[PDB]
Design a protein around this ligand. Sequence first.
Ligand SMILES: Nc1ccn([C@@H]2O[C@H](COP(=O)(O)O)[C@@H](O)[C@H]2O)c(=O)n1
Length: 124
Amino acid sequence: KETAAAKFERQHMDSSTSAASSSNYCNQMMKSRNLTKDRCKPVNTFVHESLADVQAVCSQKNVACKNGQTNCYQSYSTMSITDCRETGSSKYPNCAYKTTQANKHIIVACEGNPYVPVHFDASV
Ligand SMILES: Nc1ccn([C@@H]2O[C@H](COP(=O)(O)O)[C@@H](O)[C@H]2O)c(=O)n1
């Protein structure tokens, strides 16, 4: 299919832009990264930092994942992120999302060799 590291990049990386501008950013990106394909994914975060800066988080602050696993890492500083949340009215296949741009720390789960991000856990 897609490796776990490639799937994480397709779903969460957006380094071409420094930040979301229109309230339309999430509807466009969720569609173009195929996250509304079989359903509307309810929550998805896009990170506007270089891939290298996000991968560096795997060697930063070790914290437990929401699942109780302990291979989660929190970035020491904040990063530009865009939170995409499905609206209460949205209905597959007419998926609608609310866009929220912010600067927060991210929490990612890392794995393999090289040890890289394979899952976006939360933003704080
Ligand atoms: N702040 C958040 C919370 C979850 N997510 C996405 O939602 C998926 C499922 O969320 P859970 O962490 O709730 O399992 C995550 O794998 C991640 O792709 C996200 O992108 N941003």
